[PDB]
Structure 1
Amino acid sequence: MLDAFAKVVAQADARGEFLTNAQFDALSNLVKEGNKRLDAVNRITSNASTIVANAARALFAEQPQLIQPGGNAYTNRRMAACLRDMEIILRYVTYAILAGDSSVLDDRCLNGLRETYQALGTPGSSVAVAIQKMKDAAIAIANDPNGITPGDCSALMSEIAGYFDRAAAAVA
């Protein structure tokens, strides 16, 4: 896997080049914005259980067919595995936030996932919905002005939202 720094190094090596002054500057900004990234990760992670449980409850409320008998999330085994998948996705999304790059999310979570759901009979569109719910909740928690040094994290929330959208696209 790559983080944002290794990502740049990997691009530069493919060219056989030293970093340009513009790339140093970029990467120095990343470092300067580091605290905010750590807050986002902390906040989302510290609230992982409620993000998932609240998003599950919302999903099943909007799509009760998933938990009707015969439904894909009916029985505790299928419920447990569904909740699990929501946990897994949120986990890799937070890794991605830490790294500032999606390679861990793409490589270790998102690849083969659509095909996997297609084989099981799990409706990917429903998964996408659950991811979006977690997204909205993750971002409200991460971007909460209370109890934190005031500043703008908008760029970061955009990036974060991007990992969630990416994940939702991968399954939908």
Structure 2
Amino acid sequence: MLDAFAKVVAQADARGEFLTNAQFDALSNLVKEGNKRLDAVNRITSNASTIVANAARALFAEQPQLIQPGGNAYTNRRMAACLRDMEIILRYVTYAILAGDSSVLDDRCLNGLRETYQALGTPGSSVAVAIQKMKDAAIAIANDPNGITPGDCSALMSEIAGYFDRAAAAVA
């Protein structure tokens, strides 16, 4: 696993190089933006249960075939596995937000997941819908202007959306 700082170090070590002034500046800027990143992680995590449950309810309303007898989320064991997957994906996305790097999400969650769903018969396209719903809710929560010192988090929200889109593309 790498965070954003370790990523720059790893690239430099492969070249055998000390960091340049521009690289130092870029990492100093990440630190200066760090409070916003902590707020986003806190806000998403603090609302994780409703992000998951609301997205799940909406998926099953739009895709009732998943919950009809014989569908992939029918029976409580399969429903529980589906909710668990949503929680897992959200969890690893929040790890990537804290790290400022997708490696933890790619390595511990997304790699091989498409093949897992294919072996099981789980519709990865429907998982991607659930992920996109969680994305929209998580960004609305993280970027809520109420109750926080005003400032611009647009770059961070674009980064957050990227991690969610990466997960959705990995399963679809």
Fold conserved between structures, TM > 0.5: yes
**CA distance, structure 2, for counterparts of residue 171 and residue 20 of structure 1:** 38
Structure 1 residue 154: deviation in Å?
0.2
Q: Could you tell me how far 1:92 is from its partner in structure 2?
A: 0.1
Distance (Å, rounded) in 1 between the aligned partners of 2:118 and 2:134:
22
Q: Once the two structures are superposed, what CA deviation does each residue of 1:112-153 show, in whole Å capped at 9, x if it has no partner?
A: 100000000000000000000000000000000000000000
TM superposition shift of 1:22: 0.3
CA RMSD of aligned residues (A): 0.2
Structure 2: state its 5+ residue gaps: none
SS for the counterpart of 2:168 is helix
TM-score with structure 2 length normalisation? 1.00
**Number of positions where the alignment pairs a residue of Structure 1 with one of Structure 2:** 172
Unaligned runs of 5+ in 1: none
Deviation at 1:35, TM superposition (A): 0.1
Q: For 1:158 and 1:80, how far apart are their aligned partners in 2?
A: 31
Q: How does 1:3-82 map to 2 (within 5 A)?
A: 3-82=3-82
List structure 1 runs of 4+ shifted beyond 3 angstroms: none
> What SS does the aligned partner of 1:131 have?
helix
CA drift of 1:95 comes to 0.2
C-alpha displacement of 1:39 = 0.1
Following the alignment from structure 1 to structure 2, what is the Cα–Cα distance between the partners of residues 21 and 11? Answer: 15
Residues 27-46 of structure 1, C-alpha deviation per residue, up to 9 Å, x if partnerless? 00000000000000000000
Shift of 1:68: 0.2
In 2, Cα distance between equivalents of 1:95 and 1:84: 16
For the residue of structure 2 that corresponds to 1:44, the secondary structure is helix
Alpha-carbon distance between aligned partners in 1 of 2:121 and 2:88, rounded to the nearest angstrom: 19
CA distance in 2, matches of 1:127, 1:11: 34
Where 1:114 maps in the other structure, the secondary structure is helix
Deviation for aligned residue 1:109: 0.2
Deviation at 1:50, TM superposition (A): 0.1
Cα deviation for residue 21 of structure 1 reads 0.2
Structure 2 SS opposite 1:69: coil
Question: Any idea what the Cα deviations from partners look like across 1:65-124, whole Å, max 9, x if unmatched?
Answer: 000000000000000000000000000000000000000000000001000000000000
SS of 2:69's partner is: coil
